[PDB]
Design an enzyme around this catalytic site. Structure first.
Site, PDB file in Angstrom:
ATOM      1  N   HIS A   1       0.816  -1.203   0.000  1.00 49.29           N
ATOM      2  CA  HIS A   1       0.000   0.000   0.000  1.00 49.29           C
ATOM      3  C   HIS A   1       0.856   1.261   0.000  1.00 49.29           C
ATOM      4  CE1 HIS A   1       0.098   0.172   4.593  1.00 49.29           C
ATOM      5  NE2 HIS A   1       0.354   1.422   4.256  1.00 49.29           N
TER       6      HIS A   1
ATOM      7  N   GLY B   1       3.025   6.376   9.947  1.00 54.29           N
ATOM      8  CA  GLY B   1       4.389   6.238   9.497  1.00 54.29           C
ATOM      9  C   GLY B   1       5.114   4.981   9.960  1.00 54.29           C
TER      10      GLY B   1
ATOM     11  N   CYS C   1       4.208   1.873   9.447  1.00 59.99           N
ATOM     12  CA  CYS C   1       3.971   0.762   8.552  1.00 59.99           C
ATOM     13  C   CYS C   1       5.307   0.266   8.021  1.00 59.99           C
ATOM     14  CB  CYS C   1       3.043   1.194   7.396  1.00 59.99           C
ATOM     15  SG  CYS C   1       1.324   1.627   7.894  1.00 59.99           S
TER      16      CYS C   1
HETATM   17 ZN    ZN Z   1       0.273   2.773   6.071  1.00 57.34          ZN
END
Ligand code: ZN
Ligand code: ZN
EC number: 3.4.19.12
Lengths: 306, 306
Positions: free
Chosen positions: B41, B143, B145
């Site tokens: 993503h 942030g 991720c």
């Molecule tokens: Zn994310």
């Protein structure tokens, strides 16, 4: 969201740990620049621990009686003085891995990370509090002496603790990196008592603010209180006194949450005075005092890059 | 003595974190050999999160639309495929810092360390459990991720988790390093429900054994119980079923403490059935299920050198 007892990343420290052997007796040391630091009792063995005469012990097993390894036997030991309870080993070469570092003495209630080491290699890392009575409730087995505590954030390591002993109750005691014990303890093994351990009130309150930011809001007052009536109650439950200095360090959190400190203070009381109910707050059925105000903020405004 | 929720030292992992930017959208990636791995993503932005068409998105912003930095803008991006929910970036050079590593998929109830990262630099580390319902109760801000979870001990890193999303309740969800989600979740942002979260019974029992080794012995039975009558009770309190496999992994602890598993099992019941009393065990007023049997033993027999 969510909230965990987080430790500092330990990378900059794992590369500074060596082992030190002097006779038998082998423990962990801290290799910065051309100096290894380690507990001076590495020069003792058996009934030496009962009453060590450190100056008499140290004048005999010389510089070649000390072996310091970094990831293999091969550091040359060419010097030594005793700074307080710490040994200090003038050695041959700088560590090709020495990070930007500093030595600090911290105050009760402050937190730091411990890198638990056994014979020179990292075992694990956890975050804890220096208690009001200058002990830590650590996790240490035999051989972990010389493990260090530190704070980061920045570009560096701030070194604040070196592990020296377990007291007869399971509590732990150690020094700053200048070899001055925290608290009234000595690196001997007779009979040593620490404080009544009190609760770090400013840290509980900071943690209540973290709970509100997380949405765990059931305990909130609305009431208010005076700083005198608060402190009168805090005490008879063995909570340290809140002062105006504490109120000031909490203001950033007050500002975020719209909850004034005295109002949170008023909220802490009822938790103390009336009940907790075995309702939970942020995972816990008690109250939690090993998060500082800076720790709690350390999430909004500072943990990486721009 | 003492006992803390310890994490693995994070050194071997801090040197593998990069950042990945693709458009706007910049998150953390994992640089092993010549491949960066990161949440797919990273190619989305706004209402894309609502229903992303990942294959349609990925065929347009090409290889030069992806910037991967390790401690500075300067890795060259010359390839890309999508393995499940993970991006995979064929890049120019090996990491001069890539540790010995492996990818593993772990089971509910197992524990690991998370290195929370924000734009490519380490923030902190904590130890947690993969819950029976395939979520983790982490600590993640925007942030983070691409932050990863791992196990060590050995010479290496066993990588088991990559962070992808926060569900609408504060719980966290992610993938293995082959991009297969743990649990029934997808990297979209509509409506996603996880389990009833049950308590990891074998971990509670392992933790009771750690308490006995620590000398926190007030709760011990003497009684005994059947594995059927136990499991009948465990359930109506939302504790997962103990089986013979669990009994076997606990035998080392039984042997050390002289307390048979069924006897500890008999002890757990009364804590469940009758009262806890807000007596404490090893710091906690509840029961604790984020220590495995291996974690608890990890202290006698394995954390450094011979
Ligand atoms: Zn994310
Ligand atoms: Zn020692």
């Amino acid at each position: 969201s969510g909230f965990r007892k987080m430790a500092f990343p330990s990378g900059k420290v794992e590369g500074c740990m060596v082992q030190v052997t002097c006779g038998t007796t082998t423990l962990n040391g801290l290799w910065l620049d051309d100096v290894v630091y380690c507990p001076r009792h590495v020069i003792c063995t058996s009934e030496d621990m009962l009453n060590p005469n450190y100056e008499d012990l140290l004048i005999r097993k010389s510089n070649h009686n000390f072996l310091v390894q970094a990831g293999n036997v091969q550091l040359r030991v060419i010097g030594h003085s005793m700074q307080n309870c710490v040994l200090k080993l003038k050695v041959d070469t700088a560590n090709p891995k020495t990070p930007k570092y500093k030595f600090v003495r911290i105050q009760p209630g402050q937190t730091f990370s411990v890198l638990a080491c056994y014979n020179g290699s990292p075992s694990g890392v956890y975050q804890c509090a220096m208690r009001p009575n200058f002990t830590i409730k650590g996790s240490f087995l035999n051989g972990s002496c010389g493990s260090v505590g530190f704070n980061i954030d920045y570009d560096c390591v701030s070194f604040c603790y070196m592990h020296h002993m377990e007291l007869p109750t399971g509590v732990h005691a150690g020094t700053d990196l200048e070899g001055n014990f925290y608290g009234p303890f000595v690196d001997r093994q007779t009979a040593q008592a620490a404080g009544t351990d009190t609760t770090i009130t400013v840290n509980v309150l900071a943690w209540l603010y973290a709970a509100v930011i997380n949405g765990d809001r059931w305990f909130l007052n609305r009431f208010t209180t005076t700083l005198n009536d608060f402190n009168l109650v805090a005490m008879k439950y063995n909570y340290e006194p809140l002062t105006q200095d504490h109120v000031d360090i909490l203001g950033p959190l007050s500002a975020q949450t719209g909850i004034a400190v005295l109002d949170m203070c008023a909220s802490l009381k009822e938790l103390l005075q009336n009940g907790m109910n075995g309702r939970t707050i942020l995972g816990s059925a008690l109250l939690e005092d090993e998060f500082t105000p800076f720790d709690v903020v350390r999430q909004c405004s500072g943990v990486t890059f721009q």
